[PDB]
Structure formats: C-alpha cells, structure tokens
Amino acid sequence: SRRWFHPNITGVEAENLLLTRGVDGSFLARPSKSNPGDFTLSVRRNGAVTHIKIQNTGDYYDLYGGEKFATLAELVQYYMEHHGQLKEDVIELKYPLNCADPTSERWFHGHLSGKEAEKLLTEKGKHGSFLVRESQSHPGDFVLSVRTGDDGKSKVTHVMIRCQELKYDVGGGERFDSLTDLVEHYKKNPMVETLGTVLQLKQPLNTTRINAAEIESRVRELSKLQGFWEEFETLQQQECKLLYSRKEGQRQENKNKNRYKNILPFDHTRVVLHDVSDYINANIIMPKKSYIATQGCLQNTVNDFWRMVFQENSRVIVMTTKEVERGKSKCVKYWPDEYALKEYGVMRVRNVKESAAHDYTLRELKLSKVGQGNTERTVWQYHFRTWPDHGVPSDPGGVLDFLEEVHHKQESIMDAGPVVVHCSAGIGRTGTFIVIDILIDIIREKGVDCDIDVPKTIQMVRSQRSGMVQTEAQYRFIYMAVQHYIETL
C-alpha cells in the first residue's frame, strides 16, 4: 500500500523504471515539479508509457481525463476496482511498481547520529519506540534503535543493518530489497535476543510533537533550503491507512446529492438525517467543540442542508468559498438576501442583517421550521471571501481574526451544536480552517508551553473525512497561522 508513489524520481527515471522493471499494466505516481501541486500517473501500455496529469490547486485531486478525488490512494483504488473508466482506450492499472525510497517513512531519520538517537529514545520514547538512521561508522549501512521496558527497567537496544548489493539485512537470515521491507518484516515477527527480550516494533519515535512556545524555531527548521516537504510527504504516505468504507454515498439513490461523485463521506462518521432520506455529503469532525465538514450546497441539496443545520442544532456557519470561482459554481446561494425571507422545504430562513467586514461578510439568519413557529434560532453565517483562487493567502491575519470572531460567537451560544464549515468539495479549505481552529483552541485553553502536533492532528481529522488539508501550501499555512497566533500574545 502506497508503495507506488515515488517522491524523488524524474520523468526520465519513471519511464526507465516502467520499461526495465515493469510489464504491461505496471504504474507509478510521482510529484510533477513543474507546477507546485501537480502529480503524474505513469502507466505502461503496449510497451510504451503514458502519463496522465493530476492537478491539485487546493480543492481536490483533478485527474485530467478522469474524475476528481480526495486523495491519491482513493484515486488508485477507484481504478483498480473499476477497469473501464480511465481511457486515453482503457488504461488498466494492474501492478504497482513499488518504491524503495525510505524518505516518506515515519521511522526513518536520515542524517541522525547515534548519541542524539539515544537521547530522543530515552526522553520522548516508550516501550516499542523505534527509529532507523544512517550509519556514521559504515557509510551505506544503517542502525535500528528500539526501546524496551515499562531506574533500569528500560533500555535501548541497537541493531546494525548493512546494505550489500542493493539488499538489506540484520546480519543473518533473509536479505530484503528495501529498508521498509525489512522494517515491515520485523514489525510482524520481531527479533528475539539470546536471554529472552524481544525487540518489539510498535510506534515510530515521535519527531513532530513540539512545544507551542518555541514554534518559531521549528518553522526555521522546516524552512531552510526540504523539511516542510519531508514532514508533509510522510503524512501523505499514511493516507492508505484511511481507506474507510464510503458505500452510503455510492448508492444509486444518493449519486446526484454529491457535487463530485467520488468525494464521499465516510460511513462511520457521516451526518445521518433522521426525521425520509438520510444522506447528506457531510461528516462530523471531532478533535469541547465539534465541527461539520460538508461540500458546497447543490441546488438539489439545499433543503437537505438546512435539515442538517436544524437537526445538529448548529448556530454558526463558516463559508470559505465564493458561489462561483473561475468558471463553475463552487456553492449555491442557500441564504435569502438581506431583509428577505425564504422557505427551504419545511425550513424557513430570514436574513436579518448583513454585517460586511474586511475579510468576510457576517449574516445573521433566523432559522425556523414551518408550523409551530417558535422553532426560531439564530444561525450566524460567516462568509470568508479574501481567499485566493489558487494557493493560500500570503498573511494568516485575515483568517486568524475570522476564526477568533467565529470562536466567540460559538462560545457565546451555550447550546450550539457543531460549527458548519464548508467550501466546494469540503476537504481543502474546510480542512485547513478546521485544523487551525483545533490547534488554536489547544493553545487557547492550555496556554503556551503546551504540546502541539500538527501532522498527528491532520491525520486524526483525515480519519473522519477523506483528504482534509489538500496541499503542502495549506500545510505550510497551518504552521504559519499558528506561529503568527503565538507571537501575537
């Protein structure tokens, strides 16, 4: 899984790999370095190699000649099960050509010595924490460092790993074709010492958890000329662990309720409407405040959108897109104009006051249900619009003040359900906004000197909706937004 993505190969290496070590049906994926958010799917057909462009400007993964997907792993999974949709006709993805690069692995710390490794395993480590580093004594070899224990009840065991003719081994037994093949093997049947102890490989040693106080120094680490690219691409490697089922969105009854038919909510965290149809392209996101991540409203799902807002007792909506961007509708206008009142099915919305601002426009909406009348509750709709059509803003100030205002409006309503956040697909800007809000709330309550782990938080959010935080630029922005937020204290 995920072994088919080669992060450090050129277009020349790609075709040479598929023609020397691949057969008709072999494929790989590589980051196109001409555009900053574009990838290439190279497949072997009839002895030649074709290249399909995959572009991601922050909203989704746009496979030209195909469909739009939340992750690269979900894209490849879709076509390995649905042979007959990737056409030039018919491009079959049969055999993934695995990569031997251990760069995107969580346990691999290339330029790391042995004495720094022990201090990390002893301070931040626990039982089963391991890492692999490049050897200082034998150039080309490696070292496996494990911590086993519960004063002397713990220790750190070193295991030499030497590379002989493009194959790796621990000095005996089997010789593996790559470090990850070796690590995955002893993660399954761990080594046993002479006197009993077993080198259990549980979790990789945590590198990314930092103290929120000294975040400006950590950005200096990831930004010198990359560290930011390493940390983000390693996170992307773990998306194959999140291929949860999405059957409810795939049903025939619900195909037209999705803006993009392959960007679907997870079944186990989807918002279920129980009052009748139950489907809406939305997921509940949990970090004492929760969020709802959803697509932009379709003209045929606006009534379902307000059914969700009423059911979940939401009082704050965060919209981070325009209704149309470039040329197509990213969202349908689902609110009445100022001083007007509209009916959306059994739900009734009045626009009481539009309060325009620097970076956004605040709309005070009165949501109610037809009939009894006293169901009226105020829903504050925050509409961000100083967001570029491509990339991220240069300064996080407009987003940071926007979140501070949303946070107080949510906290002043001690009865509110989740905070509805949406854009176009509901994974790109919606992911960046929710992650920043989750991280700031930690700094908000526990103050500074607290622990912050950005990729761990993104991976948790990604377990609840496919492909939260789309691009490295958004990943850069989250670090920049938290850095800017701690320096303003």
Ligand SMILES: CNc1nccc(-c2n[nH]c3nc(N4CCC(C)(N)CC4)cnc23)c1Cl
């Ligand atoms: C459940 N998932 C999950 N929990 C916590 C963290 C991460 C993570 N994301 N990115 C990461 N990068 C790390 N380092 C930098 C790149 C390197 C030198 N190649 C290896 C060490 C270490 N951890 C991560 C992930 Cl995935």
